[PDB]
């Protein structure tokens, strides 16, 4: 039985699994008032990928395919391809193309295109509204609003690189993005399918532990806090190791290598999320060189030392 | 501890010189020019070299506060380290980790969040790594943007790379040059603490390159981007830290659908791969093929022709 373990990496050395940006800090908070069900950064401890989770960090919230537009519009419809530029399969038992955004918001990025005619290139500012009725990646279609009405060609490889999130600056619509609200992956009047399950602390006094990054904002006052259940490196590491789970709960200690002192302990659940013993919203204060260490498998009656 | 390389197909892995996925394998002659990239540099026992760091998303990014050049849409960025604490120029590395290791013009987005009340803004931005004012080792880089009024001073600012540009003409269609290092301290200075140049030493051998196509944002840039090791291999060696038992590790590229070996190659301790082939060649590989470490060999092992 191959022994289980987590990578020796500091928080800042790791990557958010829900947007291609580095981790910044750890956060814990109450989560009973809403549904926590992200589809990226979902992986079991024995290396089973869930939801829309794939291995590469750079591919989260990216799109590839060819685009079309009606005459003189700045809106382009992208017919999605799989990222290796082969055909996309809508029937495959997944919620949406692997790496698809798993929150409702406006993502701003750049739409680049290289034409096979002579190799010429071009890129323009583009925005995708993931809460739009016309956002249906599971059906293989998304729509971008851009800065051109003439420059992109049909039947040519086009890619979308995400940059950040936007907001109109006002107070009337200052509730976006909503990181815990999944899009309708197939468009209006449909239900999502093959979702990774929602998570919640069941043990009394416990809250989820979130790995937090700050999304860049390109305008106004967006919700830039972005929390994921596992760092992308853990997803990658579990997929590689595939160590059998000896129990439903793995005990992690967060250690400071400068002193060897344990700062806090936490539970890593088999299905792939972390909880701590704490009540209230809290930005954890951690030393620069700290990292997580797996110490043992425990039963389900283990009470964490308060954080 | 036994040495090994990850069970990952090429398409599942990431270029280590630009935040984009790998696409294919390429081999070619490299005696006519100097091969010395500083990103994706790692020894087999997990020691990072050059400007190489672990996260793929940080490659070719810049962080710091910006100042504005009057009578231009250009900004000077005073660099910070990735966690926004101060950057130390005295640290013995060629440049901040993740700094671009090629000469070309990179297009991306300059975003900023002001600490006064939290409002944000982003603008199209371009950095020329061959610029005289491109001096990352000194903690300064210069961006060209589409505004002259919108950014504020002493506020966290980030540059997100997207791709490379070229002016469309033939006169300057020689950029980017992926095998030409920038002058990290600005024009007419010498780089320091560089990871060494590599070359096949065994007769009949060529480097094996891990190739991606960079997004182009304008004109006809050089978009082929080759790295010596996948970012994941860097990540894996760093984690594994298996001591090298020899100077050369023999890898076989295997097709699991059939169990047959497609070709073999050398993975050198110093962190690069060579194959036995003469001439430029885009490798044809099965979708699920992967690399396998089979045994340590000496320096006199003759590879089966690829």
């Amino acid at each position, epitope marked *: 039985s191959k022994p289980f373990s987590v990578p020796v990496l500091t928080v800042e050395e790791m990557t958010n699994s829900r947007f291609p940006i580095p981790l910044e800090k750890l956060f814990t908070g109450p989560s009973s008032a809403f549904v926590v069900q992200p589809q990226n950064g979902r992986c079991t401890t024995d290396g089973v990928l869930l939801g829309t989770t794939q291995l590469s960090p750079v591919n989260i919230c990216t799109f590839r395919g060819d685009v079309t537009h009606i005459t003189g519009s700045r809106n382009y419809t992208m017919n999605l391809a799989s990222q290796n530029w082969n055909d996309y399969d809508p029937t495959e038992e997944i919620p949406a193309p692997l790496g698809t955004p798993d929150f409702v918001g406006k993502i701003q990025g750049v739409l680049t295109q290289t034409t096979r*005619t*002579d*190799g010429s290139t071009r890129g323009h500012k583009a925005t995708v509204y993931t809460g739009s009725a016309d956002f249906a990646p599971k059906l293989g279609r998304v729509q971008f609003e851009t800065d051109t009405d003439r420059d992109f060609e049909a039947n040519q490889n086009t890619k979308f690189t995400p940059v950040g999130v936007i907001q109109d600056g006002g107070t009337t619509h200052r509730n976006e993005p909503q990181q815990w609200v999944l899009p309708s992956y197939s468009g209006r009047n449909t239900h999502n399918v093959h979702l990774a399950p929602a998570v919640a602390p069941t043990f009394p006094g416990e809250q989820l532990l979130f790995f937090r990054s700050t999304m860049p904002g390109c305008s106004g006052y967006p919700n830039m806090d972005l929390d994921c259940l596992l760092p992308q490196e853990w997803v990658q590491y579990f997929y590689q190791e595939a160590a059998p789970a000896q129990s439903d709960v793995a005990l992690l200690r967060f250690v400071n290598p400068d002193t060897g002192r344990v700062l806090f302990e936490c539970k890593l659940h088999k299905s792939g999320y972390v909880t701590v013993a704490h009540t209230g919203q809290h930005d954890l204060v951690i030393p620069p060189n700290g990292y997580f260490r797996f110490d043992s498998w425990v039963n389900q009656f283990y009470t964490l030392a308060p954080m | 501890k036994p040495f090994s390389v990850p069970v990952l197909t090429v398409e599942e892995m990431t270029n280590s010189r630009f935040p984009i996925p790998l696409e294919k394998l390429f081999t070619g002659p490299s005696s006519a020019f100097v091969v010395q990239p500083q990103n994706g540099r790692c020894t087999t026992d997990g020691v990072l070299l050059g400007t190489t760091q672990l996260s793929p998303v940080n490659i070719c990014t810049f962080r710091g506060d910006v100042t504005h050049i009057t009578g231009s849409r250009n900004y000077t960025m005073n660099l910070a380290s990735q966690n926004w604490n101060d950057y130390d120029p005295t640290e013995e590395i060629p440049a901040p980790l993740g700094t671009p290791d090629f000469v070309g013009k990179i297009q991306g987005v300059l975003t900023q969040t002001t600490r006064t009340d939290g409002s944000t803004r982003g603008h199209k931005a371009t950095v020329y790594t061959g610029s005289a004012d491109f001096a990352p080792k000194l903690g300064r880089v210069q961006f060209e943007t589409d505004t002259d009024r919108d950014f504020e001073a002493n506020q966290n600012t980030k540059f997100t790379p997207v791709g490379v540009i070229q002016d469309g*003409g*033939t006169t300057h*269609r020689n950029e980017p040059q992926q095998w030409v290092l920038p002058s990290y301290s600005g024009r007419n200075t010498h780089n320091v603490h560089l990871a060494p140049a590599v070359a096949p030493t065994f007769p009949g051998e060529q480097l094996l390159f891990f190739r991606s196509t960079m997004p182009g944002c304008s004109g006809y840039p050089n978009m082929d981007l080759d790295c010596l090791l996948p970012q994941e291999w860097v990540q894996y060696f760093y984690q594994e830290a298996a001591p090298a038992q020899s100077d050369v590790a023999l890898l076989r590229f295997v097709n699991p659908d059939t169990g047959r070996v497609l070709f073999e190659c050398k993975l050198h301790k110093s962190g690069y791969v060579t194959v036995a082939h003469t001439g430029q060649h885009d490798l044809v590989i099965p979708p699920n093929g992967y690399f396998r470490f089979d045994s340590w060999v000496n320096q006199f092992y003759t590879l089966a022709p690829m």
Partner: antibody
Amino acid sequence: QVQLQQSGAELMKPGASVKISCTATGYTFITYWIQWVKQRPGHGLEWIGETLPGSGSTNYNEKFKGKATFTADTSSNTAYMQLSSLTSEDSAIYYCARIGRSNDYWGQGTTLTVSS
Amino acid sequence: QIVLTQSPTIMSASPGEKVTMTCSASSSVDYMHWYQQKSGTSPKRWIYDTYKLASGVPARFSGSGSGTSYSLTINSMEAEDAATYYCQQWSSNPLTFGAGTKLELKR
């Protein structure tokens, strides 16, 4: 996808100036550079220069700086090259070309003959 | 300027022969490109970035080289291939072509 149409054959006396037309269809004209190339029977291909129509941007081969002038009429999608002070060594086939990375688009060519 | 010297200036081949023509540069270049031209028609970009094939170019063609020495190769000559081939360079302005290699057919 692109087509370049050039003006007809020209026959000029020495010392005159000729203006050759290159009309581009199939793309946004002011977005691509036009290259101009000279071809003499025993002298292979020679690059005159390039220009980006509607903008001031031009790059001349030093040998032709002062001989060839590039202008454009963007309304009409036409690029022009003017050659001044014609001598017999200007007798050649002249091409306009949109030269890309992987493929090109060349005009059909314009034959110029200079003679007394 | 970068002078490209092609060799041979003219040659002939039987259908099926292996054909090789070379380009030598006065200075180093990063990529070499090749053009095909037939009598009465404009030049067509044949090989670009040293080894990559342009549109419509048969798999029997190939290119190789680095620094100052490059070559174009046809593993099996066909009648369709009889034409004149020019090599071409971008590394230094001005852009330059070689004088050309005239390929004729044997019979």
